[PDB]
Amino acid sequence: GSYNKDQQSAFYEILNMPNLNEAQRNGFIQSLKDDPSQSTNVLGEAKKLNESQA
Amino acid sequence: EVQLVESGGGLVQPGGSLRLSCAASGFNIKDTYIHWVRQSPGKGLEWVARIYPTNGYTRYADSVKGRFTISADTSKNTAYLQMNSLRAEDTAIYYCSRWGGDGFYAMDYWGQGTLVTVSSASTKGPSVFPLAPSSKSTSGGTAALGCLVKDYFPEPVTVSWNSGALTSGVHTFPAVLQSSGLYSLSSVVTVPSSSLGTQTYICNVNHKPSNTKVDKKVEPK
Amino acid sequence: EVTIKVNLIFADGKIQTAEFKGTFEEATAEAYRYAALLAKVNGEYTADLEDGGNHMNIKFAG
Amino acid sequence: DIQMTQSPILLSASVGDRVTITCRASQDVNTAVAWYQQRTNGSPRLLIYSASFLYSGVPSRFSGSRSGTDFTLTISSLQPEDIADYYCQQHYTTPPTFGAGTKVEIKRTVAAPSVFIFPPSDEQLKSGTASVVCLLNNFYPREAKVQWKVDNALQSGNSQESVTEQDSKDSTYSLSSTLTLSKADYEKHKVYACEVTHQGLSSPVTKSFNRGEC
């Protein structure tokens, strides 16, 4: 379906994370689609995982 | 008849992702809450998440918030759990259940559960060896025989005898983790001594994670 | 974590056993609480401690 | 959050006995508490909901009650198939939480095990490891001591035990003890013996074989 500019931003951040593998990147993107109410939490965990794989 | 069936469980490395499905039938998930509940091996039940598919309202356990997401597709009468950033402690059987169905304020139906194993270790199929009946496995006119299902990962394995036709007198032991990090178990069955050599005994072993399916005929030496 | 083992001895001579786990003080408290609860239906209880409090024999009056 | 404290951890009683399991909520949960039964390798099964109401198809020997924050599950005439873990769960507030579980087991008369031993298979010996299996079948109580001897030398650190859950009909246990050696070590020795001590046996029982005997 369609997204607001906040949802689009969240996708963009995860899409660009350099230390995630493609399974993880797509897993997190899927979570953003799954439950929009959890956007902030999902992004937080993706950031943490990205940082730990630096 | 109300039924829920989970699928999608399997071995994943720490940091990895998996997606579980909960397929409902005999009722519409639009009319109830759907929950995910997990159970670490040998431990208790722990609530994971819940959704009300009619309005999309969700709640999560603190320990999975941000890492797992619950969702539902009412047109497929199916709920899902996306699981990212997985950790060893997430290893569990994951059940889905309904709540509020038919006005019952409890989890009245549960699926069979699907196993999630979070580990860096590789899949390995078992070797299956006979435990042949002999003068050392018989007494009182009955005799024990079986199969040793050795060196596999991850759980689980299933064992049946004679394609499920033989169930009386069977003991399939709980798997034991060896020091190598691989599992092993035996399944034994007790039968009349007089049937040895006339009645065929085969253990049917299945280890789905490695696609291993073995039918081993067990005979006196 | 300790395990307090308990024999529950009922007026008609039936015997059950139970285990309570936690810190020694938690498990103790739970054992006495369980006794008080069973006593409502099974009559006044008496608890005899053995093994420095790690085992109890709890008898109900009936 | 609300926690549910379940007691005892383990309860053992005879067939026909009345058993009582308890659950305590850390604060008021009204009647929003359910009880589930979980048999070995099975899914949880709803027994009682809203503290005291029996789920359809559940036998009437199960009942539940409430006093304040104290909840009780009673089984009035314990049956061998009632062996299971039992869990309470509150839905008064989110997160809904479960008690840690109570295991219920059956007490019955003493029964000595049938003791059997299995040499490694020729197939296994084709590769480099030997497993020797000692089986104790259909005994009670669960406690049992199994020791391995190879050429009369007591073994340590090279065996593992697995025990079945209590049988849902006869309330017995079975146990396997598996001795693991390399093929080289197995071929170096002659006599493999499993010694079993159990309450039902008047003295310990040794089951033994010589490598190579048919």
UniProtKB/Swiss-Prot annotation, chain A:
It is found in: Secreted, Cell wall. Immunoglobulin-binding region D repeats lie at residues 4-54. It comes from the Bacteria. Important immunodiagnostic reagent because of its ability to bind the Fab and Fc fragments of a wide range of mammalian immunoglobulins. Each of the immunoglobulin-binding region repeats can bind the Fc region of an immunoglobulin. Interacts with host TNFRSF1A; this interaction leads to the stimulation of both surface expression and shedding of TNFRSF1A. Belongs to the immunoglobulin-binding protein SpA family. Unlike many other strains of S.aureus, SpA has only 4 Ig-binding domains in Mu50. Plays a role in the inhibition of the host innate and adaptive immune responses. Possesses five immunoglobulin-binding domains that capture both the fragment crystallizable region (Fc region) and the Fab region (part of Ig that identifies antigen) of immunoglobulins. In turn, Staphylococcus aureus is protected from phagocytic killing via inhibition of Ig Fc region. In addition, the host elicited B-cell response is prevented due to a decrease of antibody-secreting cell proliferation that enter the bone marrow, thereby decreasing long-term antibody production. This is Immunoglobulin G-binding protein A. The chain holds residues 101 to 151 of 450 of the full protein.
